[PDB]
Design a binder for this molecule. Structure first.
Ligand SMILES: CC(=O)N[C@@H]1[C@H](O)[C@@H](COP(=O)(O)OP(=O)(O)OC[C@H]2O[C@@H](n3cnc4c(N)ncnc43)[C@H](O)[C@@H]2O)O[C@H]1O
Ligand SMILES: [Zn+2]
Length: 277
């Protein structure tokens, strides 16, 4: 396949411009009915997992004849302030759906409901049965990549071959996840992209489905993105700093993470502060 544009220069918004943009983002969240978030490799860099096309990204370092650096294992990695902010946003009903390109499995481990999440490129902790399609969320990473047999069998008897959910460059996106991600993105009046370069299709094109129906588009990234020209608001800064300032404006606290936990279905929305005039 193609690695795309790697190691592009990073842009940083000054403290004055950044503060005004987070308030503009807060206004867009309060006024929107269907908010869909789009996450990429950048929202995991603050946890010790490198991105792909950033200054020290996997494909950027490969081009330089160097190896990417991991400051953690996927099992010892803890969800960032951004992952936990997204958990709270969903809990208070301010987040309708979450579309992710990340294989790190941090969204599931943070306690985010799996029925409001589309894992387009898979999850390295999730293995699927080839016969009944039943998914298994493991506490450790699945040893195989490229939808290959792991060795373990189904327990629902079915006894079907369990395969990884990691897609190779040539593999097609999962039908259920892509259909739900496309439906949510199309029907959203606000799509916010966090830590994604938006260079890989159809994943990168999903936030544009919002823009096609008069819906608003917000892009939060350090480097420039493929669809920068069609964003209503472009925030250049660290996703953790942007989300921390956002939660403060919304009057929401970032919840504590008490270790890896799996939530299959979303609960009814928890009480949230009243909306400003
Ligand atoms: C293997 C596979 O099947 N698919 C992978 C991956 O799933 C897919 C998606 O790419 P993405 O998720 O956008 O990573 P990025 O291109 O490196 O884009 C990440 C973006 O995050 C930005 N970024 C990094 N840290 C950030 C931070 N703390 N705050 C804000 N932005 C950040 C960075 O500038 C980069 O532009 O590309 C494929 O190689
Ligand atoms: Zn099975």
């Amino acid at each position: 396949a193609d690695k795309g544009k790697c190691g592009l220069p990073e842009i940083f918004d000054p403290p004055e411009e950044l503060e005004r943009k987070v308030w503009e983002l807060a206004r867009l969240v309060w006024q929107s009915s269907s908010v869909v978030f789009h996450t990429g490799a950048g929202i995991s860099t603050a946890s010790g997992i490198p991105d792909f096309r950033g200054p020290h990204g996997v494909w950027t370092m490969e081009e330089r004849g160097l190896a990417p650096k991991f400051d953690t294992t996927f099992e010892s990695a803890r969800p960032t302030q951004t992952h936990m902010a997204l958990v709270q946003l969903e809990r208070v009903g301010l987040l309708r759906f979450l579309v992710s390109q990340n294989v790190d499995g941090l969204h599931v481990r943070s306690g985010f409901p799996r029925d409001k999440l589309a894992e387009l490129h898979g999850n390295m902790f999730v293995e699927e049965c080839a016969k009944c399609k039943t998914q298994y969320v493991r506490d450790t990473v699945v040893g195989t990549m490229g939808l290959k047999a792991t060795g373990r069998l189904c327990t629902v008897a079915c006894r079907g071959e369990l395969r990884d959910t990691i897609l190779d460059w040539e593999d097609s996106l999962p039908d259920r996840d892509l259909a739900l991600a496309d439906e949510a993105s199309r029907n959203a009046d606000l799509s916010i992209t966090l830590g994604t370069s938006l260079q890989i299709r159809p994943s990168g094109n999903l936030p544009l489905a919002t823009k096609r129906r008069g819906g608003r588009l917000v892009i939060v990234n350090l480097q420039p993105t493929k669809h920068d020209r069609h964003a209503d608001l472009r925030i250049h800064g660290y996703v953790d700093e942007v989300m921390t300032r956002l939660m403060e404006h919304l009057g929401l606290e970032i919840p504590a993470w008490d270790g890896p936990r799996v939530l299959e279905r979303a609960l009814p929305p928890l009480p949230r502060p009243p909306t400003p005039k």
